RNA sequence: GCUAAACCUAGCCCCAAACCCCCACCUUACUACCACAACUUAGCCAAACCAUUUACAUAAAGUAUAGGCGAUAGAAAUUGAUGGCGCAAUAGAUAUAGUACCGCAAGGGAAAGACAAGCAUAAUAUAGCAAGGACUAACCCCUAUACCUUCUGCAUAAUGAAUUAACUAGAAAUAACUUUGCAAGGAGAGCCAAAGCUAAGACCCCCGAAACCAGACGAGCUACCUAAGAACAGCUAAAAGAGCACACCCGUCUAUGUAGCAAAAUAGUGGGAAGAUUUAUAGGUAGAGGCGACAAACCUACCGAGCCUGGUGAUAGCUGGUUGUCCAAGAUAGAAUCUUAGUUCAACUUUAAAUUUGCCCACAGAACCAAAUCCCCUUGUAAAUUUAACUGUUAGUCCAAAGAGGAACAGCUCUUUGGACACUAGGAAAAAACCUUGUAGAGAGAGUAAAAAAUGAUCCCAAACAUAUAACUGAACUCCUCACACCCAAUUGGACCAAUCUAUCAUAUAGAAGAACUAAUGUUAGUAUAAGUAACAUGAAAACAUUCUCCUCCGCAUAAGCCUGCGUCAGAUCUGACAAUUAACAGCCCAAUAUCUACAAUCAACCAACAAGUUAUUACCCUCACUGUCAACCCAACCAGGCAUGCUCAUAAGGAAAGGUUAAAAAAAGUAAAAGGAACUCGGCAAAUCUUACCCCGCCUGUUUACCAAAAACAUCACCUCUAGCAUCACCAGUAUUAGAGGCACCGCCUCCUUAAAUAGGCUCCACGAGGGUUCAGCUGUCUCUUACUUUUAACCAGUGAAAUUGACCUGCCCGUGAGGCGGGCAUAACACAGCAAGACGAAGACCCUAUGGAGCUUUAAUUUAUUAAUGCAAAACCUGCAUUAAAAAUUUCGGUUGGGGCGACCUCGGAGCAGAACCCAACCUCCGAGGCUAAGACUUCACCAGUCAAAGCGAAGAUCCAAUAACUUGACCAACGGAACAAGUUACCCUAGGGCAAUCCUAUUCUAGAGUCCAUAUCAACAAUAGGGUUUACUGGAUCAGGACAUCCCGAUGGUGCAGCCGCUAUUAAAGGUUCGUUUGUUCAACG
């Protein structure tokens, strides 16, 4: 800024993003989309729904190397669904463990390391 | 018509593949043959200084991490791995070649081979940016201030260009926009995804410093030193840095010369010339180093720091440039910044896109203490806001007005409202800034706008006109017939396109790219201009055998250097072949071991000194090989220069000062000069003559700024001060009477005259000085005052033949504007030749300011102790590690506004007039101080960063980074107060890039009013008023020639007088003519005869 102090500089530091490296992501499943590629036979409800299948029909794209560790159950769309499924995710709301066991469903968060 | 112009390939560039190749020679390299050793990149460069710091498959990922946490730097785990839209002789390699040539050296480093400019055929005719309108007609008439770049516009204010041809300067991401595919998914793994993804398309130049660091090359020049050599006539004087003076060395003063004979010479005049002298030969010292009788002197022509290669395409807020066509939008609020020669933000501009209000604006409304301004209903309009995406400009000039500063003036600094300019056109003379006028083309149509004067210094300046009806003239404005995108800088958008290559046709559609030159003191080649100019050269006659005239510190030889460089023949105006220089002279040397090796040389004897100057034994009975041998010569680019020694000392040797002519100027050298003899001049410089006296400085001889200073500076004997008790590489094969480093400068003594005239001259201390000043006498063309002759130059004829310079020129004078070119007058047929120097701001060197350029010097400016030296502490009598103290260095910087730059103040924030009435507006203008939580909406110091108010609701009544921190958070400095974490004084040695209508007053005319023995006018004439003219520092003369005005000093004419008269005094008129010589001195005057 021609020798006054820049204004990237004088702003304080703050830790916006110490540790971004490091906290862990999840990309959201809605069950929108969890009911929408059951419709249209991409994922198998007839058959355990694991992270693998939910790729094999590219419902979702997961990134290890960008520090996603897997998919989370997001509430949106509690109403409308009706699908019996038997998902295992990498963590879920109060609301999706409803959704899914409402219709009769079996949902287990499991972990999975970045290897 | 010459000059030229043209061509193809010789080769090369980038890939792929494949791992590539007889003799002599480290001594003086290219020479057959005898007794030591090699083993961290600093810094240019970024941070806009600089100091820590700063780069040398794909994906993960520009993530972790590092960092004056600034600039920037930056992983890993894991993943998986024969060809050419190339050049084609200024290109491609530098290449026909690392040759020629340059340099001592390292090293640098070429060229080329196959009807353009310039001229001729054919010189020109008043006049003028060389053209346009035209015209029957080339000129003549009317119009018409060259181009680029930089400053606000620039008449050329300044910079650049002789001219042609070739070569020569916009490379790329983050987003965005456009068009395709696919679309909740895109993508040929890694990435993105709340309509996004993938692909393509578009956008970021060239030349130039002083410098820095590293490694090489240089002491054949010069500075000094070493080894072993050489030179120094004659005279005077006898052991001396002695005197006069040759060879030799230096270079005082003047003149010539200034691209010269010479990148420092020539001629004369000068200093030394037995010494601290001069000099040939080999060796040594090497660049922050050497050497230095210190001058920043010299180290291979350019040294306040050599040269070459590399880092290097150094960097450059600075200068200069930046190439096809056409159209369109397009300009002067401000803030911060080691900042005002620049950058970033804003404001303004541009494009694309979305939406709906934008501008004008009456009535109402805005405070207590003149102009106008603000705000909106309508109305005339069609624009405005918002979003996405970039660049560019920024502190401009003039005019009207209101203010502040300088008078209410100085064409003066600053703020504000408006206009114009940097855009077109017409007027006021020329004319950016006044008046008139805009939207662009063709017309041999038309209507208008503005627009005419009244009553001191070269040469006045349109010519004229008192009285025939007021209208006409006059633009790119407007109308007319036709056609329409077709007149701004920086910037931005768009439509076209020259030429080349590739794909397909086989000029088009596409794709590409070294893709376009009126301009960089651009580079290379060609040819011009100055120019057939400046300059150069061959003694005479002849019968080519010879004779004559004149000249030389020259000639012959060796050495050094060079290497066939005027011998014959044959071809030309130099090319090839042939031939040569014969060793006795000179070089090329030596078997080993021990021993010795005290006393000079000077005609070497007298006196006298100091600087002190080979063999005995052992081994060998071998013979002349090898090389230089020439010349007109070498170092200076080819040369009035440089070049050691021996002998000839005016020549037995060697040469030629005049191409021919005439006898102009100016110039150069020389000779002569009447009377006077320094009156010249800064000065007796030069020349002629040869004498004297003093004063200042330095004791003396010597040395120094190669190339502007030879000195009053350096050195020097003598004296003094400081340090040092001693081995084999200097001091030193030395030892306190010695050695090194400093100051000073022997010795003794102390710690009014001058001239006619005058600003000049007048601690003791002999000798000396190209030192400085003064004087006597003489001398002389220095001068009063120039003149003649000779030589060179010169001018002409003949031969050979440059260079700076050059935008184009068809190149006048006077006045005005701001000048050969503009305006108004005047002049004007064309053309050589020789002169001159008034003008063409005619073609190196200085001075002021700027740069967060460079290099220094000093320090009590900041940072360091790495290196050394002392200690102190551990380590096994010495070295290693750590710490402290010092010296020695090393790296680094020099804030801003300013009287007249310096001195001195201030630098952030706040309040009052300028800024009278919403907002804002400068000051080194005017006057003063300060350092509870949550949350709708808003205001603001014209950016940002900061800053400010706040309904309701819930609860109680001076920045960033760093360190200490558990913390809740915390502070100093940053006051140069938008802040480098820590840096001053200075550059007379500096280098590069650049910029350059007077308050107070002087004088004359107006009231006379005051005086003058009476009386203003015979004189001063006070204040004031009206006139023409300047005052810058504190808090440029002289010679030479002079042009001009009159405001007249003289001469001329006239009036009054208190001159009763020449002369005086004032006043009018008059510029044809004239307006002296000297002493002292040089802000230039003044004084004096
Ligand atoms: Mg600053
Ligand atoms: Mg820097
Ligand atoms: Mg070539
Ligand atoms: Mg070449
Ligand atoms: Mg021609
Ligand atoms: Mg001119
Ligand atoms: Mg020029
Ligand atoms: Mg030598
Ligand atoms: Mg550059
Ligand atoms: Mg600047
Ligand atoms: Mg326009
Ligand atoms: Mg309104
Ligand atoms: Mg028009
Ligand atoms: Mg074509
Ligand atoms: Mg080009
Ligand atoms: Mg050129
Ligand atoms: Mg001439
Ligand atoms: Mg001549
Ligand atoms: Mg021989
Ligand atoms: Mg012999
Ligand atoms: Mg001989
Ligand atoms: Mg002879
Ligand atoms: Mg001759
Ligand atoms: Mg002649
Ligand atoms: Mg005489
Ligand atoms: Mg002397
Ligand atoms: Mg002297
Ligand atoms: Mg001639
Ligand atoms: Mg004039
Ligand atoms: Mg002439
Ligand atoms: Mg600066
Ligand atoms: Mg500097
Ligand atoms: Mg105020
Ligand atoms: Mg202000
Ligand atoms: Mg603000
Ligand atoms: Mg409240
Ligand atoms: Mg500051
Ligand atoms: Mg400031």
Same mark, same amino acid.
Not at 56 to 79: F, H, M, W
Not at 89 to 113: H, M, P, R, W
């Given at each position: ?8 500089? %004088?702003?304080? +530091?703050?830790?916006?993003?110490? #540790?971004?490296?490091?906290? %862990? ?5 809605? /069950? ?6 059951? =419709? !249209? #036979?991409?994922? =198998?409800?007839?058959?355990?729904? *694991? ?7 590219? #419902? ?5 190397? +960008?520090? *996603? $560790?897997?998919?989370? /159950?997001?509430?949106? #769309?509690? =109403?409308?669904?009706?699908? +019996? ?9 109060? !609301? ?5 066991? +409402? ?8 972990? $999975? =390391?970045? %290897?």
């Amino acid at each position: 800024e021609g020798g006054q102090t820049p204004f990237y500089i %004088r702003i304080p +530091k703050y830790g916006f993003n110490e #540790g971004h490296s490091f906290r %862990r992501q999840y990309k959201p499943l809605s /069950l929108n989309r969890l009911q929408y590629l059951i =419709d !249209l #036979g991409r994922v =198998d409800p007839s058959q355990p729904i *694991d992270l693998t299948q939910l790729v094999n029909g590219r #419902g979702v794209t997961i990134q290890p190397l +960008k520090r *996603d $560790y897997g998919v989370q /159950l997001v509430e949106e #769309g509690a =109403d409308t669904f009706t699908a +019996k499924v038997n998902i295992e995710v990498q963590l879920a709301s109060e !609301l999706a463990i409803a959704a899914i066991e +409402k219709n009769g469903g079996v949902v287990t968060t499991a972990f $999975y =390391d970045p %290897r």
